[PDB]
Design a protein around this nucleic acid. Structure first.
Lengths: 117, 117
RNA sequence: AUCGGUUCGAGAUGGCUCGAAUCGCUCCUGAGGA
């Protein structure tokens, strides 16, 4: 059972906007998502499960970069500034994968391990 | 020199809004900060220096939680929903420390090391 | 006019229906205006 604070924490960590999360994860309007983050309405179960699943996918993304850093190379990571240039390189992905790509790449750029292209 | 992608990456990692960074870090209008992130105008050096200094404060905070994690403790971290609630417990801080606190609390909640109150 | 971001207000309160402030896109002459 979630809490509005930790729901907002997971949403802000994965670099999602309110309307993007409302359309693609909630399937609700943005006002309903704002009422879930405010505690006026209780967070549903499936939203909790899907956000925990997306955090697991983020851990699977970080494991391969740790695997490459174990091999002594220095990775180059793609930081797409716009969704259309992301979809030019990615046929079968959406805005969630773009946000996950940005949130994974920003971490390893800030820690000094990798480079952004 | 710092590219616009790296500036946007560090800004989105620290959970700062455009207007907040434009007022306190940039001391400019938000229209100019969008030009620095869009690539129409070059990033000034004194913004680069400030963002790297702030990221070092974040690394210091993560080390400070990790030294408590080394004791076998399960730390209960504080996530603040509002700026005035943070200012009640931190009279001499401002909005930047609130955002940094929120990012560190979200990161340690997500990976299972900590609990949120 | 139209379209985006952030923060909020009501209502037999439901994953619902209506609204508000402000910053932008656009136009003019690290800035100011409608």
């Amino acid at each position: 059972s979630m809490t509005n604070k930790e729901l907002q924490a997971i949403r802000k960590l994965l670099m999602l906007d309110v309307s993007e999360a409302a359309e693609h994860i909630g399937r609700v309007s943005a006002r309903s998502w704002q009422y879930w983050e405010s505690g006026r309405s209780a967070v549903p179960d499936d939203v909790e499960q899907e956000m925990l699943d997306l955090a697991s996918v983020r851990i699977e993304m970080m494991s391969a970069i740790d695997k490459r850093l174990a091999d002594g190379e220095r990775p180059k990571l793609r930081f797409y500034n716009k969704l259309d240039e992301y979809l030019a390189d990615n046929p079968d992905h959406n805005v969630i994968g773009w946000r996950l790509s940005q949130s994974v790449a920003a971490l390893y750029y800030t820690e000094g391990h990798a480079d952004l292209i």
